[PDB]
Amino acid sequence: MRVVVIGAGVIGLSTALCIHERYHSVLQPLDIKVYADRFTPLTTTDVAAGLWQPYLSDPNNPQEADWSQQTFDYLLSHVHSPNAENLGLFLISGYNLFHEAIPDPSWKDTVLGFRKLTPRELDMFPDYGYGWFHTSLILEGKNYLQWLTERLTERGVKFFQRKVESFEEVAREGADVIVNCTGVWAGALQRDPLLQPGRGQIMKVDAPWMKHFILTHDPERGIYNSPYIIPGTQTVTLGGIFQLGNWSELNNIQDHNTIWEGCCRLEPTLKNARIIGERTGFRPVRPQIRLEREQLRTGPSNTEVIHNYGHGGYGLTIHWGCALEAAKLFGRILEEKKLS
Amino acid sequence: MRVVVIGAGVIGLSTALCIHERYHSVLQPLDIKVYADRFTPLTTTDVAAGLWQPYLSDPNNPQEADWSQQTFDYLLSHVHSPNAENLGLFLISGYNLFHEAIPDPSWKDTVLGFRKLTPRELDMFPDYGYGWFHTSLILEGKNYLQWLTERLTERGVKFFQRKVESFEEVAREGADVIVNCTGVWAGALQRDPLLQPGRGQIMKVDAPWMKHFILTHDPERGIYNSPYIIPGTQTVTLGGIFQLGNWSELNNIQDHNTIWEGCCRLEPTLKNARIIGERTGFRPVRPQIRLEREQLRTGPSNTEVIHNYGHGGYGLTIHWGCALEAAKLFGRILEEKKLS
Numbered sequence A, B: 001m002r003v004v005v006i007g008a009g010v011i012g013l014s015t016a017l018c019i020h021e022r023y024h025s026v027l028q029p030l031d032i033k034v035y036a037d038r039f040t041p042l043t044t045t046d047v048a049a050g051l052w053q054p055y056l057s058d059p060n061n062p063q064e065a066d067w068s069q070q071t072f073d074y075l076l077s078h079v080h081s082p083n084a085e086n087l088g089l090f091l092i093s094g095y096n097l098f099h100e101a102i103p104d105p106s107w108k109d110t111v112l113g114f115r116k117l118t119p120r121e122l123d124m125f126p127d128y129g130y131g132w133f134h135t136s137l138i139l140e141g142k143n144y145l146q147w148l149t150e151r152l153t154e155r156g157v158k159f160f161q162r163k164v165e166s167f168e169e170v171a172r173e174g175a176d177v178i179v180n181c182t183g184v185w186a187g188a189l190q191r192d193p194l195l196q197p198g199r200g201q202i203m204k205v206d207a208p209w210m211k212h213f214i215l216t217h218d219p220e221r222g223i224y225n226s227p228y229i230i231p232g233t234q235t236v237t238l239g240g241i242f243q244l245g246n247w248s249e250l251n252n253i254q255d256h257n258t259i260w261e262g263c264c265r266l267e268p269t270l271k272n273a274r275i276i277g278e279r280t281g282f283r284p285v286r287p288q289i290r291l292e293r294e295q296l297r298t299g300p301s302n303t304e305v306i307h308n309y310g311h312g313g314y315g316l317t318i319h320w321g322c323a324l325e326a327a328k329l330f331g332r333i334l335e336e337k338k339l340s
């Protein structure tokens, strides 16, 4: 039973591992392999700060709220294991800031100590007039990928660096199941008109005195297009760029001044920060995630494909739920294939 | 009008600058001079995390409750500006942990977002059943002391490196007023039996993933004598050592182990951390701060003395209220002298 996962960002690597650990003892030849064009230094996953927080509004597929709540609990049960550092996992508090009051978000009892800004906290932000403060989790993508990687390897899940043209090339070559974890690029292997790039751009800066996340929200510039400051483990992420449809994987001088001006307004101490790096990535945007089966009518008998992509600005937030569900699906195949 | 300040600690410099800023325009020759035995790399002040937090009970002298309060409004009103990193100021949230319930602190409203630990929070803490969370300030001692220095130097105040054997030597040599900011060493100039050193030992460690302060209290063992973890700007401080009357300015093997054990236990990820540095100091302990006047008879006329010492473990949390207060007292000497 040879299983091929396509793609090595968080969605693939997490799905590969969650699938291994749940079914390695109940399948004898269970061969897992990861094919991916770009690996762990070079993915959208690596560009993400890793803060956990779903959209303000409720999911088109209400299941998603579970997947988020799930990923959170799991990471939270692990915040104090003594790996977390390796992981890139840690607790962080910070501010959400709005121009006008807004309902409480749905996840408010998932996060630790949710609550509203007191006018004192607000005064430090001339431009914003209401907001939240709550304690959450960051899982830095770069480390997490490095981590998932070492877990997978000792499990002898094998990695190949290679761009795949179709599902049939892979089905032709051996595989009974394909886990489709291709993110923004998913369309190139099965036209999906619903899935667009949300180009995003970020500045990594050296400002270690910054201990809180600060996120600004504005319906006029719209989701993720508004200044945010996110302390990482070695570095602070400075962002707020979102552009539907943009395919330029290039750092753009305009966008740089925008990040830079928006965050200075927000935190003037950032004047003396040293820029370290700058990076661009594509949000796999979609009205909702595609996480579902398809029997692909390849050759004599068709092969099974699990889809898992279109995770948008919240992949790190939801990956774990998503992987449990990818695996459940996978277990559903097994029984139907009379092999459990 | 010739002023000697003894002590280049936080109290000395802060007061020195408060006095100058408040009176160089009203007094014609204002000669302010700082005399110090040890300077700004080598004082107790340089050992302090710098986290604003008064005792959890009410101050003997409840004027202290205001001095602490004013200090925090003033620091907060300077937290956003291109200065703050120079001063070493910044905001930080975190946890107070107790075994049993305790009444709220009297400062509860001074800080931002003071609140009780919800049970999900307290689960991250096996060893503890109760606590608070809130957002306070760090003013790291070393930076603060460098900032005061260049602020003083540029205001013309002169520094001298020297040990002063008696008030009278300095009156003798020509001071109209002496400002006694000599900390735990005060009594070497005027016997104060109530003044005692609480010895303290801390570890500076590398764990930048740490974004909250975490303070534990056990009354079986005292204040400052139970593990605390305070992240700084460049480094995280591990302490929990308080010892009345010890005068050994030497790092100690057992204290080291106690710090490292209690801290590793509070936060397991601390195990893979790099030990950077270690330091000892003497909180200048005393039932209350001594902050008053006394005219020292000393030949033809008496020199005026302002004492400002015995700040124990809340030196930074309080310095500014105190300095405002020494200037108040200074102002009074002036007017009485028919010089206001």
Ligand SMILES: Cc1cc2nc3c(=O)[nH]c(=O)nc-3n(C[C@H](O)[C@H](O)[C@H](O)COP(=O)(O)OP(=O)(O)OC[C@H]3O[C@@H](n4cnc5c(N)ncnc54)[C@H](O)[C@@H]3O)c2cc1C
Pocket: A006, A007, A008, A009, A010, A011, A012, A035, A036, A037, A038, A039, A043, A044, A045, A046, A047, A048, A049, A050, A051, A052, A053, A162, A163, A164, A165, A181, A182, A183, A184, A185, A186, A188, A189, A199, A200, A201, A202, A239, A280, A281, A282, A283, A284, A308, A309, A310, A311, A312, A313, A314, A315, A316, A317, A318
């Ligand atoms: C600037 C920015 C900030 C973000 N911040 C956050 C955040 O703070 N929190 C959060 O929860 N999320 C955040 N995100 C969202 C997160 O980055 C994405 O959701 C996530 O990386 C998508 O995961 P993925 O595995 O689907 O994508 P990717 O990491 O991009 O994985 C796609 C993988 O598939 C490979 N691949 C694709 N097609 C093929 C093919 N045909 N053949 C071979 N290999 C192929 C690629 O090489 C890559 O390995 C952020 C995103 C951006 C852009």
Ligand SMILES: Cc1cc2nc3c(=O)[nH]c(=O)nc-3n(C[C@H](O)[C@H](O)[C@H](O)COP(=O)(O)OP(=O)(O)OC[C@H]3O[C@@H](n4cnc5c(N)ncnc54)[C@H](O)[C@@H]3O)c2cc1C
Pocket: B006, B007, B008, B009, B010, B011, B012, B035, B036, B037, B038, B039, B043, B044, B045, B046, B047, B048, B049, B050, B051, B052, B053, B162, B163, B164, B165, B181, B182, B183, B184, B185, B186, B188, B189, B199, B200, B201, B202, B239, B280, B281, B282, B283, B284, B309, B310, B311, B312, B313, B314, B315, B316, B317, B318
């Ligand atoms: C381990 C530890 C942690 C602490 N953490 C905190 C914290 O997190 N937050 C907080 O608010 N406070 C904290 N404190 C408290 C704070 O460090 C002290 O209250 C404060 O630094 C004392 O200020 P000072 O100027 O009175 O003393 P010092 O900084 O010791 O200054 C005394 C100065 O007077 C000089 N001097 C004395 N006698 C003479 C003389 N005869 N002639 C010349 N010079 C003389 C010395 O050379 C020195 O320059 C901590 C203390 C310790 C020990």
Ligand SMILES: O=c1[nH]cc(CCc2ccccc2)cc1O
Pocket: A049, A051, A053, A054, A055, A200, A215, A224, A228, A239, A240, A241, A283, A312, A313, A314
């Ligand atoms: O694409 C992104 N996803 C996620 C984040 C984290 C910060 C954030 C911003 C606004 C709402 C919720 C989270 C940043 C991104 O740039």
Ligand SMILES: O=c1[nH]cc(CCc2ccccc2)cc1O
Pocket: B049, B051, B053, B054, B055, B200, B215, B223, B224, B228, B239, B240, B283, B312, B313, B314
């Ligand atoms: O001497 C000290 N002063 C101050 C602190 C700050 C942490 C703390 C711990 C318990 C109560 C209040 C503050 C640490 C010291 O060791």
